[PDB]
């Protein structure tokens, strides 16, 4: 029952990029999301002989801990906790305070 | 004559110089077979799967090399190869 997931607009609670927003690209098994335009790390990509060999520095989007992000409300205009309930047969998520469905 | 199992005998065609020189000049095919696989079972397999006239099969067991990976030593698997001579009606 993961609260932050794939196609979900989040906001960052802690880190150099505090307050920035974006969509999650892929949550990892270790418990870390990769949100786009957040942890831009300037990697030095070594030109490997096989396949492509560009030879240049690149701004990769590094992972961030799931707990450092919270789903954006798009109504209140700020971070918000996530819950779980059974609307109809299936299980679904909801926002704490202003109880709406995602 | 031993259906279904014959398919599991032949693993792969072997690639080498010695393998190549025995294609044209000697009229054979070298190939990796199952560790069981008798000369009859190889012949009978080549006769149905590859579908060519087999003169005779010569067989040998290759021993695995003891390699390294930093600290932990490891030995490769003992595979078995089969020099299969073919008749005048040959192709591949």
């Amino acid at each position: 029952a993961a609260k932050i997931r794939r196609d979900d607009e989040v906001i960052v609670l802690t880190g150099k990029d505090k307050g920035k927003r974006g969509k999650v690209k892929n949550v990892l098994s270790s418990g870390k999301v990769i949100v786009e335009g957040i942890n831009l790390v300037k990697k030095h990509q070594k030109p490997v002989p096989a396949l492509n060999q560009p030879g240049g520095i690149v701004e990769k989007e590094a992972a961030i801990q799931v707990s450092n992000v919270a789903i954006f409300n798009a109504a209140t205009g700020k971070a918000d906790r996530v819950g779980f309930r059974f609307e109809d047969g299936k299980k679904v998520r909801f926002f704490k305070s202003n109880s709406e469905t995602i | 004559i031993r259906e279904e199992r014959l398919l599991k005998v032949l693993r792969a065609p072997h690639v080498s110089e010695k393998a190549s020189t025995a294609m044209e000049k000697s009229n054979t095919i070298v190939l990796k077979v199952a560790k069981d696989a008798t000369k009859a079972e190889i012949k009978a397999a080549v006769q149905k799967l590859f579908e060519v006239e087999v003169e005779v099969v010569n067989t040998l067991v290759v021993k695995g090399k003891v390699k390294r990976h930093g600290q932990r030593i490891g030995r490769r698997s003992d595979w078995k190869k089969a020099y299969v001579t073919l008749k005048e009606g040959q192709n591949l």
Binding site: - | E3, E4, L7, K8, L10, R11, A12, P13, K32, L49
Partner: protein, 60 residues
């Protein structure tokens, strides 16, 4: 596929085993070692599909 294969005849289900073995597994196994094969996932799913069949024909 298991649900569809579960409703089959005992003699007819062998033909799928023999078809899975004849080509597919052998063909891809010979084709993989020669370097002609790009799609490597096929070796696995066939091996599973055999297991599936061979389990399904263990009815007694």
């Amino acid at each position: 596929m298991k649900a569809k294969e579960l409703r089959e005849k005992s003699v007819e289900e062998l033909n799928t085993e023999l078809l899975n073995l004849l080509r597919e597994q052998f063909n891809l196994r010979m084709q993989a070692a020669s370097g002609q094969l790009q799609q490597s996932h096929l070796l696995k799913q066939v091996r599973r599909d055999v297991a599936r069949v061979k389990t399904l024909l263990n009815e007694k």
